[PDB]
Amino acid sequence: TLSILVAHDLQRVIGFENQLPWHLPNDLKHVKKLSTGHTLVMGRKTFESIGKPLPNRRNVVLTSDTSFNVEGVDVIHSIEDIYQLPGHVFIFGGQTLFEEMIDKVDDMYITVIEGKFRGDTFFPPYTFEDWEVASSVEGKLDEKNTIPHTFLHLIRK
Numbered sequence: 001t002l003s004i005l006v007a008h009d010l011q012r013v014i015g016f017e018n019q020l021p022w023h024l025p026n027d028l029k030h031v032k033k034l035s036t037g038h039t040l041v042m043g044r045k046t047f048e049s050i051g052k053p054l055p056n057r058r059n060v061v062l063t064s065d066t067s068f069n070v071e072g073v074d075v076i077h078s079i080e081d082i083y084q085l086p087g088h089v090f091i092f093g094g095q096t097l098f099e100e101m102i103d104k105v106d107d108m109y110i111t112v113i114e115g116k117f118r119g120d121t122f123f124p125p126y127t128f129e130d131w132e133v134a135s136s137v138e139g140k141l142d143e144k145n146t147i148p149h150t151f152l153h154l155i156r157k
């Protein structure tokens with residue numbers, strides 16, 4: 001199974017200056033639940049912004065740098081290498097990789113952040129004419145999660 005895994009705001013912002021524009025612990029847990037024991041694929045910039053590989057899953061970084069070699073990280077140099085990865089593979093970021101993969105993936109796990117943030121990186125446009133809503137779950141607000149958000153599982157028609 002090949003999935004997209006992304007959080008974007010009302011205008012499809014996913015990032016600002018190498019970081020996430022919002023602080024939302026429930027979504028990180030959502031990411032952890034979904035991807036633990038599976039595979040995350042990410043472009044080089046996304047990985048460097050994270051800093052280190054995420055625990056308890058395969059971390060695959062796509063780059064053209066043939067010197068790239070980080071411990072805990074597997075490296076691929078072609079989009080085409082993605083299709084060779086076994087198991088449940090999540091396309092994790094960033095804008096460049098989302099643009100390359102959105103027409104190829106089976107489904108998308110989107111967290112819609114219900115706000116308008118300043119961004120410099122965006123999720124590509126997509127229409128619900130192409131995607132069935134398998135589920136839509138409102139996130140709970142609290143002490144530490146103060147921005148409305150909705151977990152979507154979209155499946156290609």
Ligand SMILES: NC(=O)C1=CN2[C@@H]3O[C@H](COP(=O)(O)OP(=O)(O)OC[C@H]4O[C@@H](n5cnc6c(N)ncnc65)[C@H](OP(=O)(O)O)[C@@H]4O)[C@@H](O)[C@H]3O[C@@H]2CC1
Pocket residue numbers: 014015016017018019020042043044045046047049062063064065077078079092093094095096097098100121
């Ligand atoms: N929530 C997110 O997903 C976030 C992502 N990070 C943002 O990516 C922002 C803008 O740059 P972007 O091009 O979107 O970076 P992504 O694709 O991770 O990674 C780009 C790199 O992936 C690699 N790449 C993507 N496609 C290919 C490819 N087809 N072949 C070889 N390398 C690939 C190539 O890396 P390289 O310069 O070291 O060779 C490319 O420049 C960049 O500002 C990062 O900050 C955000 C923080 C939030």
Ligand SMILES: CCc1nc(N)nc(N)c1C#CCc1cc(-c2ccc(C(=O)O)cc2)ccc1OC
Pocket residue numbers: 005006007018019020027028029030031032046049050054091092093109110111
């Ligand atoms: C975690 C935000 C997020 N949510 C969803 N639904 N899909 C995604 N693809 C990303 C993402 C991302 C990139 C990113 C992840 C993280 C991150 C940090 C910690 C954990 C964790 O503790 O599980 C997960 C992701 C941190 C920074 C960062 O870019 C700056």
